[PDB]
Design a protein around this ligand. Sequence first.
Ligand SMILES: Nc1ncnc2c1ncn2[C@@H]1O[C@H](COP(=O)(O)OP(=O)(O)NP(=O)(O)O)[C@@H](O)[C@H]1O
Ligand SMILES: [Mg+2]
Length: 381
Amino acid sequence: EVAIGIDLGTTYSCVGICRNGVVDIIANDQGNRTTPSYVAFTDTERLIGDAAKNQASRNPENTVFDAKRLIGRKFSETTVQSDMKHWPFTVKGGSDGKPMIEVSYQGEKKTFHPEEISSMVLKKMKEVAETYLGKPVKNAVITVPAYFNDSQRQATKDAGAIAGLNVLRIINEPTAAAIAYGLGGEQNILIFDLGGGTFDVSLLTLEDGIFEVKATSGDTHLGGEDFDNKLVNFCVQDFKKKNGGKDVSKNSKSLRRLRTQCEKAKRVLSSSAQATIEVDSLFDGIDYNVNITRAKFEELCMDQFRNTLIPVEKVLKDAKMDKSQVHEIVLVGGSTRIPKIQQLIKDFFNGKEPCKAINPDEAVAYGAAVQAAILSGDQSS
Ligand SMILES: Nc1ncnc2c1ncn2[C@@H]1O[C@H](COP(=O)(O)OP(=O)(O)NP(=O)(O)O)[C@@H](O)[C@H]1O
Ligand SMILES: [Mg+2]
């Protein structure tokens, strides 16, 4: 009878439950309200979530992420050829044309389909809910991007079945976000979703409790990781100017340790004017330290931030509607916490305040949890 909503994110996943028309987003074992979509294999164990992400730089070959970029795709697809330059783990095509992710686990070569890796993240999110509820969970609504095709949706559903979930429904991420905010006649809703890996803009219409996706645009390779990379590239150049041209970029472990700290500084800069990036013994036993102002971060990311408005203009053009006709702008995704992004969007919409009351990296799971409760016969929301 217990049903949960799950955001299966490219970078971070999130689980919620709606009971008595109230939605709890469930914290994991480390107290985090979102969980990295990471799976690692070591000599002794299978790590999922925070524990997998935290040892990525010590075990790059056997730490799997971005399975969402492979799920329901043929290995020969041009998106896979393009994306695989980003992965330190091995991916090969099977005789059925399906990607096979190859790792070493307890001294043995093992291969997994993308939906098997995604099943392990879903199983972790199921266990997070079960620990909180102190009861087994069987039923779930799982979200997917609006642009997901029938193969990607069915592979996501299969991941749920492998994780031990009865998948009540697959619903669109942008629709889930709109459902979270309870969005009176006809309403034009823009979902601006900027996560860790991807940027999705969706224009929805809502007449008589019925959502339709009118238009979608974005960039499958713009997200928080790209802003982290802007800080990494700066720090690499800054280290050169401090340490007689020495090049941190030659050491992939040095880059990963630097990237981890750039991501932390980026988060601090969403609520402070300044942050420190610090890595003890970064490269050649040399300590690295630098102070980054919010202004410098904004400068490094200036083009990427401003270009987020281009897909906004494109969905409005495709829907043949003026920005003045948008009733709600919903901020979704962890990167929408960046003040400069919030200011650019507000200014574009002529000072209209976006809907951002729900922690933006939780809104999709929140909506999924509402839909899961409704489809279980609970009319309280
Ligand atoms: N306070 C913050 N300031 C800036 N970025 C943040 C903040 N909190 C989290 N993030 C970033 O949010 C991103 C993760 O967004 P999230 O919406 O959880 O991912 P997702 O659901 O997996 N989306 P996607 O990766 O696009 O599929 C990471 O790049 C984080 O660094
Ligand atoms: Mg996503």
